Each structure stands twice: as C-alpha cells, then as structure tokens.
Amino acid sequence: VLSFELLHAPATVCGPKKSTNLVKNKCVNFNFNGLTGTGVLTESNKKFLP
Amino acid sequence: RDLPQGFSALEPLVDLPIGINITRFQTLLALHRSYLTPGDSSSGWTAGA
Secondary structure, eight states, X not given: OOOOOOSSSOOOOOOOOOOOOOOOSSEXXXXXXXXXXXXXXXXXXXXXXX | OOOOSOOOXXXXXXXXXXXXXXOOOOOOOOOXXXXXXXXXXXXXXXXXX
16 A cells, blocks of 8 residues: 655655756747746857856 | 955855754864873863964
8 A cells, every 4th residue: 555645844855857858949848847938049158156 | 363355255065954953052172182181071182273
C-alpha cells in the first residue's frame, strides 16, 4: 500500500518533467521553469554567474 | 584583529524546505585532549584561538 498524507506542511518532490525540444530563430510561445512568454529565441554572448 | 575594510557580496549556497521553527542558536568548536589536559569533558580541554 502506497498512501499519501494531507496537512498544512509545504510541498515537496513530485512525479512536471515537461520535456520539449528547443527551436531557435522563430516566433514561438515559450514556458521555461516558471516564466512564460512569446518571442524569438537566439544565442547570446552575455555571461551569467553560475 | 577587527574586520577588514572592504565590500564583498555573498552568493547563495543552499535552500532547504524543512519547514521547522528556529528560535535559538549555538556553535561547535574543537576541544583538544592530550597529555597536557587529561580527563573527561570537565577538566581535560584547551580552547584554541
């Protein structure tokens, strides 16, 4: 038996893992980790911090 | 002695979803035991800077 618990505790691990390939240089409707939008995705020479 | 003169920002290390309540705080150091100070935790211990 695999049973769940329900209370006011915060969330934890789950089962999204929404995987879809990446298309560039086209007007597409994108949805990353938590931020959504529409536009064209290309390559950049800007460097982030890790 | 005394903190240096400068600026330096601090990067994140880890976030934990534990969700317990924290109100107190205490720290852990090294208590040397050797031939100089023998015995239990009550007598045999030097501090260290």
